Write an enzyme that holds these catalytic residues in place. Structure first.
Site, mmCIF file in Angstrom:
data_model
loop_
_atom_site.group_PDB
_atom_site.id
_atom_site.type_symbol
_atom_site.label_atom_id
_atom_site.label_comp_id
_atom_site.label_asym_id
_atom_site.label_seq_id
_atom_site.Cartn_x
_atom_site.Cartn_y
_atom_site.Cartn_z
ATOM 1 N N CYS A 153 0.775 -1.167 -0.023
ATOM 2 C CA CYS A 153 0.052 -0.029 -0.080
ATOM 3 C C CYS A 153 0.750 1.197 0.055
ATOM 4 O O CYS A 153 1.621 1.348 1.055
ATOM 5 C CB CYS A 153 -1.133 -0.002 1.244
ATOM 6 S SG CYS A 153 -1.911 1.594 1.183
ATOM 7 N N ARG A 199 0.157 4.617 2.830
ATOM 8 C CA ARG A 199 0.249 4.570 4.450
ATOM 9 C C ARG A 199 0.765 5.636 4.921
ATOM 10 O O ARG A 199 0.576 5.791 6.483
ATOM 11 C CB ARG A 199 1.094 3.280 4.510
ATOM 12 C CG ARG A 199 0.458 1.768 4.337
ATOM 13 C CD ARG A 199 1.674 0.881 4.715
ATOM 14 N NE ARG A 199 2.460 0.717 3.416
ATOM 15 C CZ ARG A 199 3.651 -0.153 3.443
ATOM 16 N NH1 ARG A 199 3.873 -0.666 4.479
ATOM 17 N NH2 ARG A 199 4.369 -0.212 2.404
ATOM 18 N N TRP A 233 -9.027 6.355 -0.549
ATOM 19 C CA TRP A 233 -9.369 7.410 -1.975
ATOM 20 C C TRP A 233 -8.502 6.975 -3.002
ATOM 21 O O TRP A 233 -7.250 6.495 -2.754
ATOM 22 C CB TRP A 233 -9.367 8.720 -1.683
ATOM 23 C CG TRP A 233 -7.905 9.020 -1.136
ATOM 24 C CD1 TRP A 233 -6.882 9.361 -1.699
ATOM 25 C CD2 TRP A 233 -7.534 9.792 0.286
ATOM 26 N NE1 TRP A 233 -5.831 9.904 -1.073
ATOM 27 C CE2 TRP A 233 -6.437 10.012 0.310
ATOM 28 C CE3 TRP A 233 -8.517 9.763 1.507
ATOM 29 C CZ2 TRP A 233 -5.744 10.754 1.476
ATOM 30 C CZ3 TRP A 233 -7.792 10.238 2.505
ATOM 31 C CH2 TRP A 233 -6.600 10.598 2.452
HETATM 32 C C1 HEM Z 1 -6.117 6.575 1.932
HETATM 33 C C2 HEM Z 1 -5.713 6.530 0.578
HETATM 34 C C3 HEM Z 1 -5.181 5.287 -0.005
HETATM 35 C C4 HEM Z 1 -4.509 4.978 -0.959
HETATM 36 C C5 HEM Z 1 -3.980 6.221 -2.416
HETATM 37 C C6 HEM Z 1 -4.274 3.644 -1.174
HETATM 38 C C7 HEM Z 1 -3.343 3.020 -2.352
HETATM 39 C C8 HEM Z 1 -2.967 1.791 -2.569
HETATM 40 C C9 HEM Z 1 -3.020 1.090 -3.988
HETATM 41 C C10 HEM Z 1 -2.602 1.947 -5.433
HETATM 42 C C11 HEM Z 1 -2.836 -0.016 -3.840
HETATM 43 C C12 HEM Z 1 -2.580 -0.946 -4.894
HETATM 44 C C13 HEM Z 1 -3.594 -1.863 -5.021
HETATM 45 C C14 HEM Z 1 -3.938 -2.385 -6.392
HETATM 46 O O1 HEM Z 1 -3.352 -1.816 -7.385
HETATM 47 O O2 HEM Z 1 -4.645 -3.442 -6.828
HETATM 48 C C15 HEM Z 1 -3.092 -0.364 -2.366
HETATM 49 C C16 HEM Z 1 -3.140 -1.850 -1.938
HETATM 50 C C17 HEM Z 1 -3.685 -1.975 -0.476
HETATM 51 N N1 HEM Z 1 -3.875 -0.970 0.477
HETATM 52 FE FE1 HEM Z 1 -4.050 1.099 0.163
HETATM 53 N N2 HEM Z 1 -4.434 3.008 -0.159
HETATM 54 C C18 HEM Z 1 -5.130 3.873 0.670
HETATM 55 C C19 HEM Z 1 -5.751 3.608 1.837
HETATM 56 C C20 HEM Z 1 -5.685 2.388 2.531
HETATM 57 C C21 HEM Z 1 -6.503 2.019 3.548
HETATM 58 C C22 HEM Z 1 -7.385 2.854 4.536
HETATM 59 C C23 HEM Z 1 -6.073 0.837 3.789
HETATM 60 C C24 HEM Z 1 -6.714 -0.079 5.133
HETATM 61 C C25 HEM Z 1 -7.107 0.438 6.262
HETATM 62 C C26 HEM Z 1 -5.272 0.161 2.818
HETATM 63 C C27 HEM Z 1 -4.881 -1.255 2.690
HETATM 64 C C28 HEM Z 1 -4.502 -1.727 1.643
HETATM 65 C C29 HEM Z 1 -4.056 -3.284 1.444
HETATM 66 C C30 HEM Z 1 -3.896 -4.326 2.554
HETATM 67 C C31 HEM Z 1 -3.591 -3.176 -0.008
HETATM 68 C C32 HEM Z 1 -2.933 -4.528 -0.500
HETATM 69 C C33 HEM Z 1 -4.265 -5.116 -1.258
HETATM 70 C C34 HEM Z 1 -3.548 -6.295 -2.130
HETATM 71 O O3 HEM Z 1 -2.485 -6.961 -1.515
HETATM 72 O O4 HEM Z 1 -4.251 -6.750 -3.391
HETATM 73 N N3 HEM Z 1 -5.134 1.144 2.044
HETATM 74 N N4 HEM Z 1 -3.145 0.813 -1.636
HETATM 75 C C1 LIG Z 2 -8.547 1.098 0.182
HETATM 76 C C2 LIG Z 2 -8.008 1.345 -0.975
HETATM 77 C C3 LIG Z 2 -7.786 2.430 -1.525
HETATM 78 C C4 LIG Z 2 -7.101 2.543 -2.823
HETATM 79 N N1 LIG Z 2 -6.735 4.015 -3.368
HETATM 80 N N2 LIG Z 2 -6.944 1.529 -3.396
HETATM 81 C C5 LIG Z 2 -7.307 0.331 -2.892
HETATM 82 C C6 LIG Z 2 -6.918 -1.022 -3.653
HETATM 83 C C7 LIG Z 2 -8.356 -1.374 -4.459
HETATM 84 C C8 LIG Z 2 -8.571 -0.324 -5.560
HETATM 85 N N3 LIG Z 2 -7.989 -0.708 -6.958
HETATM 86 C C9 LIG Z 2 -7.705 -2.043 -6.838
HETATM 87 C C10 LIG Z 2 -8.038 -2.582 -5.152
HETATM 88 O O1 LIG Z 2 -7.007 -3.559 -4.760
HETATM 89 C C11 LIG Z 2 -7.465 -4.458 -4.085
HETATM 90 C C12 LIG Z 2 -7.545 -5.712 -4.930
HETATM 91 N N4 LIG Z 2 -6.389 -6.380 -4.994
HETATM 92 C C13 LIG Z 2 -5.937 -6.994 -6.134
HETATM 93 C C14 LIG Z 2 -5.067 -8.436 -5.968
HETATM 94 C C15 LIG Z 2 -5.641 -9.501 -6.520
HETATM 95 C C16 LIG Z 2 -5.161 -10.835 -6.314
HETATM 96 C C17 LIG Z 2 -5.700 -11.900 -7.100
HETATM 97 C C18 LIG Z 2 -6.454 -11.600 -8.184
HETATM 98 C C19 LIG Z 2 -7.247 -10.444 -8.424
HETATM 99 F F1 LIG Z 2 -7.994 -10.257 -9.434
HETATM 100 C C20 LIG Z 2 -6.611 -9.205 -7.742
HETATM 101 C C21 LIG Z 2 -7.739 0.107 -1.683
#
Ligand code: HEM
Ligand SMILES: Cc1cc(N)nc(C[C@H]2CNC[C@H]2OCCNCCc2cccc(F)c2)c1
Ligand code: HEM
Ligand SMILES: Cc1cc(N)nc(C[C@H]2CNC[C@H]2OCCNCCc2cccc(F)c2)c1
Ligand SMILES: C[C@H](O)[C@H](O)[C@H]1CNc2nc(N)[nH]c(=O)c2N1
Ligand SMILES: C[C@H](O)[C@H](O)[C@H]1CNc2nc(N)[nH]c(=O)c2N1
Ligand SMILES: [Zn+2]
Lengths: 407, 411
Positions: free
Chosen positions: A106, A109, A278
């Site tokens: 993420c 953070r 967001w």
């Molecule tokens: C507030 C603005 C936030 C931004 C800009 C952001 C940004 C991102 C982005 C760009 C990803 C990549 C996911 C993808 O491309 O599929 C991600 C992953 C992730 N974020 Fe954030 N995040 C935000 C808030 C949060 C919050 C509030 C949480 C939990 C409280 C969180 C937890 C996670 C987790 C657990 C992943 C990994 C998801 C995965 O492994 O597929 N994020 N974040």
């Molecule tokens: C909370 C928060 C804020 C933010 N800006 N962005 C996010 C990630 C979200 C939105 N944009 C993608 C999604 O990420 C969560 C899904 N993670 C993909 C991992 C995956 C594993 C295996 C199979 C799949 F099809 C996908 C979360």
């Protein structure tokens, strides 16, 4: 044992010690790096509980105090007789905030300490879950001034009584296979869409149909519910310089809210813990709109820009990618809906990483995920060595419930 | 044990068995991934198993494993190791060795070409001037008036570690960098230190933004000496844009031949510390990294200025807009002058086909995602969506410390 990370653009070197805490495994060995793979009892619970309470009491400057020790015994006694235990509100909030703090994938953070935590552990039914989710959606959305939030349903017990949100995000668009062979709407969601159809949803069958929520309380069969349309803030996508862009008919929702992950705190497992922040612009403009397996609009956009699609070397895909992304950011800004660009997000994360190194002795980070899917090397995170490791509390993936759940 | 990798765009799933042959370590453990860390005298004892493994592989590939000629070669190598402490590669083993080091280079997207590599055997070389001559021939052969040909030149192997052949430049052709008293840099800031060394060795520096550096060449553990590459041998491309006519007035150019000269080639336990190799550029190396890195020519601001982009907010994506235009200019310029170049779309599609081929015929293809994915437009290239497994096979190219850090100056 101690490890240095170098930034190759600034020559700034940081020393990581936080990694010596990690317990969970990475998937890598001495022989093989799996850095780019997407997914690599009563006796079990007490060390987990102890390790969590130890970090908690140390964080509140009360490590080894009577209040620390007493809590350790009360939890030990609760496990010994109930085979589980309950978190104090204060521990719940701390655990959730730290699960975000520890999310190595993420980029956002820097914000980890400002997370509104909604305790829904008193929830018993899917109608209950629906009410909590709508309140979460409205609170987080805040008419466009978005706020980070998580809502936490009751923890797993015998694993036959799981709370689950079956949706992968609270708000997503439907996906239909058409007689054509093409796909209408979001191809990512085809399987889930059919599951909603076989559960009884009336589908409008358009490009941008907000899926219904499919909510499982206490292990029972999940139930359909439609989010009040007035709670789902959406942005029409237009371009600040190209007037024709509006006729592509593109829209996206303001609230990214992941709902299919499992939150582990002190060995306790929260299988339904929808959370939201967001968007970074690229998530929508690069991945949702441009992945060949998603809305895949690069071909259509390039055509309207009158670019030379004869050869890949005209960089027409690249030109169209930038414009699609300029338009996402412009549209969210014009409608006053919080969004962050990849330059701003990655610069923030670098600031946050330096904070974590001085304040905590490190920051687990997964470079493959942190580097944006466009313009990688003009963002500072590209040049930043990162160490990836697993700390608890954490968010983890879990099996899709329909593969698992028995009807 | 079989390991699966999945392409998340196509759902193609591949099975790796090759990682089973992997000897060397990665830097990673069960508790830490070091996947984004840039860098995470041999005795008779260690040398024979390494020679044996290598020759077992060689003889397998030519389909002669277990043959009398295989057994005789092992024994001859064994005897030569005990008698002399090292051994000499047959020409055929050297070629195979060099091609395999390229095949095994997990950070290299261009590997589809691995088997078409011109190897120049320079193990009879003894002096810096001999080295200069070998290097000019390589450069002319490889350049081929713009129709670039992959090649490697291999100087004598390490003996006691006191007699090393080294090319001190990091590439055969690169531009000087001059750090000015006001803290600005003229030319390529990546080559400041090396330029200082050339200068101190007596190079008279033109001091422009694009001065081709001299070669600093060490033979037989002797002090390095300066040579100038003949200018007519250095093919260069002035950079212009197909639509923007002010682009040429930025005064940019680049050389056509990328030729890495600072790596160490390991084959069957032998260490070739001077083994310059060259192919052709993928456009992003110049257009993204060389021009647009903040630590390099850094022309994004000046380009976006001339494009009249909105620069008061990063959210106009002005940087991204300028980046694409620069990359268009690089490819256009090379194509127009008939100098081989490959765009990142074409190169990554090729890599994916190479990689699938390699799984089918070889049981794997070690690949480093952090490096294979291009530094712009990552996810619209098919590699982004490709799961990859990174592990170390030999023969291999390895990093080595810069020789000015280790060299014992004789005087
Ligand atoms: C507030 C603005 C936030 C931004 C800009 C952001 C940004 C991102 C982005 C760009 C990803 C990549 C996911 C993808 O491309 O599929 C991600 C992953 C992730 N974020 Fe954030 N995040 C935000 C808030 C949060 C919050 C509030 C949480 C939990 C409280 C969180 C937890 C996670 C987790 C657990 C992943 C990994 C998801 C995965 O492994 O597929 N994020 N974040
Ligand atoms: C909370 C928060 C804020 C933010 N800006 N962005 C996010 C990630 C979200 C939105 N944009 C993608 C999604 O990420 C969560 C899904 N993670 C993909 C991992 C995956 C594993 C295996 C199979 C799949 F099809 C996908 C979360
Ligand atoms: C034929 C055209 C070739 C292309 C387009 C190509 C492409 C590339 C690129 C883009 C990189 C990453 C460099 C960076 O961004 O720092 C690279 C790395 C590398 N390539 Fe190639 N390559 C080619 C031929 C070769 C040849 C002929 C060899 C040697 C036989 C070679 C061996 C390597 C090695 C060892 C690396 C790793 C460099 C490092 O770790 O710093 N490649 N390749
Ligand atoms: C043979 C060939 C063909 C091709 N297209 N491209 C190449 C890589 C060249 C060109 N463009 C970069 C350079 O790559 C070789 C240098 N590698 C950098 C790794 C590194 C390690 C330690 C510190 C650093 F700052 C950097 C080789
Ligand atoms: C195969 C590879 O691991 C996969 O495509 C990853 C790469 N990096 C990513 N990075 C982010 N932020 N999100 C993703 O979905 C992915 N996908
Ligand atoms: C820290 C990080 O690994 C480093 O900046 C790497 C990232 N990926 C790269 N990829 C390529 N091809 N070339 C590079 O120089 C780098 N730099
Ligand atoms: Zn790893």
């Amino acid at each position: 044992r101690f490890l240095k990370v170098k930034n190759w653009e600034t020559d700034v070197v940081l020393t990581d010690t936080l990694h010596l805490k990690s317990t969970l495994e990475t998937g890598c060995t001495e022989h093989i790096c799996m850095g780019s793979i997407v997914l690599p009892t009563k006796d079990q619970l007490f060390p987990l509980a102890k390790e969590f309470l130890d970090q908690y009491y140390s964080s509140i400057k009360r490590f080894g105090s009577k209040a620390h020790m007493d809590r350790l015994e009360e939890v030990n006694k609760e496990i010994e007789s109930t085979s589980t235990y309950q978190l104090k509100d204060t521990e719940l909030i701390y655990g959730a905030k730290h699960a975000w703090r520890n999310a190595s994938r993420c980029v956002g953070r820097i914000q980890w300490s400002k997370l509104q935590v909604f305790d829904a552990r008193d929830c018993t039914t899917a109608h209950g879950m629906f009410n909590y989710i709508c309140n979460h959606v409205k609170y987080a959305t805040n008419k466009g001034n978005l706020r980070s939030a998580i809502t936490i349903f009751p923890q797993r017990t015998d694993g036959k009584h799981d709370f689950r949100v079956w949706n992968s995000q609270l708000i997503r668009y439907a996906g239909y296979k058409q007689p054509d062979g093409s796909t209408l709407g979001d191809p990512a969601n085809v399987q889930f869409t059919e599951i909603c159809i076989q559960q009884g949803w009336k589908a409008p069958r358009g490009r941008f149909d907000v899926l219904p929520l499919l909510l499982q309380a206490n292990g029972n069969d999940p139930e359909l519910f439609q989010i009040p349309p007035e709670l789902v803030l959406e942005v029409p996508i237009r371009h600040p310089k190209f007037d024709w862009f509006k006729d592509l008919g593109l829209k996206w929702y303001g609230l990214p809210a992941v709902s299919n992950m499992l939150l582990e705190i002190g060995g306790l497992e929260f299988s339904a813990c929808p959370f939201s922040g967001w968007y970074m612009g690229t998530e929508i403009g690069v991945r949702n709109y441009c992945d060949n397996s998603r809305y895949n609009i690069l071909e259509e956009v390039a055509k309207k820009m009158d670019l030379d699609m004869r050869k890949t070397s005209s960089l027409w895909k690249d030109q169209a990618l930038v414009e699609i992304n300029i338009a996402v950011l412009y549209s969210f800004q014009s409608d006053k809906v919080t969004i962050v660009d990849h330059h701003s997000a990655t610069e923030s994360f670098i600031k946050h990483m330096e904070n974590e190194y001085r304040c905590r002795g490190g920051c687990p980070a997964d470079w493959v995920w942190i580097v944006p899917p466009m313009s990688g090397s003009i963002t500072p995170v590209f040049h930043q060595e990162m160490l990836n490791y697993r700390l608890t509390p954490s968010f983890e993936y879990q099996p899709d419930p329909w593969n698992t759940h028995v009807w």
